[PDB]
Design a protein around this ligand. Structure first.
Ligand SMILES: N[C@H](CCC[C@H](N)C(=O)O)C(=O)O
Ligand SMILES: N[C@H](CCC[C@H](N)C(=O)O)C(=O)O
Ligand SMILES: [Zn+2]
Ligand SMILES: [Zn+2]
Ligand SMILES: [Zn+2]
Ligand SMILES: [Zn+2]
Lengths: 380, 380
C-alpha cells in the first residue's frame, strides 16, 4: 500500500520535468515544492540571489539536522527534433519516465520531497530537523546557489549535521553505488592566435588550427595520473572547439578550445595549469588562457549517514552499495563546509546530459522508500 | 601629365571601396561603372541572375574582342574594431589606400576601367572591341556570376578573343608576376559523429573531437604532391572547425570540419575524395561529407595577350613579369570556355582577405598605364 507513495513521487516528478528550468531559471519548480511543504508545517525560507532562486525548508527545531539537497535546473536539451518525445513532455513509456531532468535530478528530487513529507506526517514530533536545500543553479556557474545558502546559514551559526544529496549515483542497478566524495573540476578556455588571411596564400598567414593540431592530440591523450585509493583517475574532455569566419577561403585568426578536467588528488589545479602551459610552450603556440575552478576534490568523513543510507538500501532492495567518488561533482562540497557529513544517492546516471534522458518509475518509487528508511535509521 | 589618369583611378577606387559589397550584393558599384562607360558610348548590357548582378559593357563591334574581367564583391571584414581605419573608409595614409577590396580587387578594377575609358576616348575608331565583364559574386558560390555571362554569350555565339583578369598577381613589386593559369579548388564539409553525454561520464559517450584529433593532424600534414612544371604544389587548409553546445559539462555529438584544397594536376578531385575517405576509414571514424568543387586546374594557351601584357609591364616599369599559376583561383577559368586567351595581372596580393587590406596608390596609377599600354600593344 506504498504504491501510493510511488504515485506521489511520479506525479511530482512529472510536474517538475514539464518546467523548462535551464540554469539558472527555476521556472516555478521551487514554488510548487514550497507550497506543498508549507501545508505540512515546514518553515519556508527563500534565499534568492541575483538570477538564482534557492529554498531552505525545515521541519523541526533541534539537532541532528538532516538536509536533503538537490537542484531544479537542468542542462540544455538540444534540438527537440532529436528527441523521441518532447524533452519536457514527461511521457511515461513502458515504465520509463522521459524528459530532460528525469534522472538529473527531478525524479530523485521528487522522491526526497515525498520521503520527507511522509516521514513528517507519520512522525510530527520527530527528533531532529528535516530540511530541504534546493537551488536553481547547480549545473552552470553555480556562484549564487547552494553556496549562497551555505554562507547564509554559517553566518548565523545554523547547523547541518547530515546531508543526503539526491544526484543519480547508481551505475547499472539502483542502489549499487553511493558517493562519499567527488573529484575536482577545472575548465580552461584557451585561445590560440594565428594570422588571418587567404587560404591560397598560407605563407602570408598562420592557420591556428594547423599549428595547434599536435597539441590538441597530445592534450586529449596525456595521462594525468592513474587515480589512487580514494578516487578514479583524472580525466580531460574537450567540450567546445571553434575557429573560423564561416568563409571557406579565409584562414581564421584564432582557435578557441574549451576543455575540462575532472581531477583526483594525484594532481592539483596548480599542477594542471602548469602542465598545460608547458605543453603550449613546447609546441611554440601563442595563446591566452582563462582558467575557471568549479571545485576541488572532496571526501566526506564517514559516519552515521553513510551507515544509514547503506543500511536503508540493503533493507529495501537487498544489495549493499559500493561507496565511490567517480562521475561528476555536486553541491555536496559546499555543504561540507558546514561540517556536515555528505553522502549522495540516487537513480541510474546512464542517460544524464544525453538526448532521450529518462528514469525508471519503479526506481523512483524505491528511491522514495530508501530515503524514508534512511530517515528512520538516522532519527529512530 | 598622366598623373591626371592616376587621380581618376584613385577616386573611382575610393568610390567603390566605400560600398560594402559583401558577396553577392553589388551595393551599387556596377551602376557607377555603367553610368560613366555609357556616357562614353559603351553598349551596356545587364545580366542579373538570382541575387547576382553582372555587367557586360562593350565599345566596338568587331574582332578581336579584348575583355577586362573583374569583380565588385569583397570578402567579409571581420570586427571593424580590429581595423586601424574603418574597412570601408577608403582612407589614404602615406601613399596607401586602405579598405576591404582595395587590393582584391576594386583598385585594379578602377584601373582597368579608366584604361579602357582613356583608350576609347583617344581612339574612337579603334580596331576590335573593348569590353568589361563585371560580376558581384566571384568570392562566394559564384554560380550566377561570370559563368552566367559566359553561358549567355556562348549561347548566341558572341566571342571573346582575349581576356585580362585584374586580380592582384604581383608578389613583392608591381609587375613581377602575371598569371597564365590557376590551381583547382575543392572544399570538403565534414561531419564526424560521436555520442553526446556528460563530460564526467565519457565512457557512456563518444567525444568526436578526441576521436578525430589524429585524423586532423594527419590531414593538415599529408603531402598531396610536390607540384610540377606547370603548377605549385597542392595545399590543404582548414577554414572552419566547430563542435560543442557552449556548455562545459556536455560532450558534443558532432564535430564539423571545413577544409579546402587548392590543387594542381598531380592530383584530381576524385583522387582527393578517395584519399580523404581512406584516411577517415583508417581512423575508424563515422562521418558524412559534402564535397563542393569550385573549379579544376586551368592553363591558358599563351599568345598575343601574354605577349602584350608582358611587354606593357616591361615598357612601363622596366621589369619582366614571371608567368605563374599560384595563389587562388579566378573567373578566368569560366571565360576560357569561350576559347579566349586568359591572362591575369594586378597589384600586390600580400594583404588580400586580411585585416587592414590596402594598396599603393602609386601602383594603382601604374596599373592604369600598364592596362592602357596593353590595349595599344594588342590593337595597334
Ligand atoms: N561549472 C561546474 C558545473 C558542474 C555541474 C556538475 N553537476 C557536473 O557537471 O558534474 C563544472 O564545470 O564543474
Ligand atoms: N567558392 C570558391 C571561391 C573562390 C574565390 C577565389 N577568389 C579564391 O578564393 O581564390 C572557392 O572556394 O574556390
Ligand atoms: Zn545533478
Ligand atoms: Zn547534471
Ligand atoms: Zn579577387
Ligand atoms: Zn578574394
Amino acid at each position: 500500500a506504498s504504491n501510493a507513495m510511488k504515485e506521489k513521487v511520479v506525479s511530482l516528478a512529472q510536474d517538475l520535468i514539464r518546467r523548462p528550468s535551464i540554469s539558472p531559471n527555476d521556472e516555478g519548480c521551487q514554488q510548487i515544492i514550497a507550497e506543498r511543504l508549507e501545508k505540512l508545517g515546514f518553515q519556508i525560507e527563500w534565499m534568492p540571489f541575483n538570477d538564482t532562486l534557492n529554498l531552505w525548508a525545515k521541519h523541526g527545531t533541534s539537532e541532528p539536522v538532516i538536509a536533503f539537497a538537490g537542484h531544479t535546473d537542468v542542462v540544455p536539451t538540444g534540438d527537440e527534433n532529436q528527441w523521441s518525445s518532447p524533452p519536457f513532455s514527461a511521457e511515461i513509456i513502458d515504465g520509463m519516465l522521459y524528459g530532460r531532468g528525469a534522472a538529473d535530478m527531478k525524479g530523485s528530487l521528487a522522491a526526497m520531497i515525498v520521503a520527507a513529507e511522509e516521514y513528517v506526517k507519520a512522525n510530527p514530533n520527530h527528533k531532529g530537523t528535516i530540511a530541504l536545500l534546493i537551488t536553481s543553479d547547480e549545473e552552470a556557474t553555480a556562484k549564487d546557489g547552494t553556496i549562497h545558502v551555505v554562507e547564509t546559514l554559517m553566518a548565523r551559526d545554523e547547523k547541518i549535521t547530515y546531508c543526503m544529496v539526491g544526484e543519480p549515483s547508481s551505475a547499472k542497478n539502483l542502489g549499487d553505488v553511493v558517493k562519499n566524495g567527488r573529484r575536482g573540476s577545472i575548465t580552461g578556455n584557451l585561445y590560440i592566435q594565428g594570422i588571418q588571411g587567404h587560404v591560397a596564400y598560407p605563407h602570408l598567414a598562420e592557420n591556428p588550427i594547423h599549428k595547434a593540431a599536435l597539441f590538441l592530440q597530445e592534450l586529449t591523450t596525456y595521462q594525468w595520473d592513474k587515480g589512487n585509493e580514494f578516487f578514479p583517475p583524472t580525466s580531460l574532455q574537450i567540450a567546445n572547439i571553434h575557429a573560423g569566419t564561416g568563409s571557406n577561403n579565409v584562414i581564421p585568426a584564432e582557435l578557441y578550445i574549451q576543455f575540462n578536467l575532472r581531477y583526483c588528488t594525484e594532481v592539483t589545479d596548480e599542477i594542471i595549469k602548469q602542465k598545460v602551459a608547458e605543453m603550449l610552450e613546447k609546441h611554440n603556440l601563442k595563446y591566452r588562457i582563462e582558467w575557471n575552478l568549479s571545485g576541488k576534490p572532496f571526501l566526506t568523513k564517514p559516519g552515521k549517514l553513510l551507515d544509514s543510507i547503506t543500511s536503508a538500501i540493503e533493507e529495501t532492495i537487498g544489495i549493499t552499495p559500493k561507496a565511490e567518488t567517480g562521475g561528476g561533482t555536486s553541491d555536496g562540497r559546499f555543504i561540507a563546509l558546514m561540517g556536515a557529513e555528505v553522502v549522495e544517492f540516487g537513480p541510474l546516471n546512464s542517460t544524464i546530459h544525453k538526448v532521450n534522458e529518462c528514469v525508471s518509475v519503479e526506481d523512483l518509487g524505491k528511491c522514495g522508500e530508501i530515503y524514508h528508511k534512511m530517515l528512520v535509521n538516522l532519527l529512530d
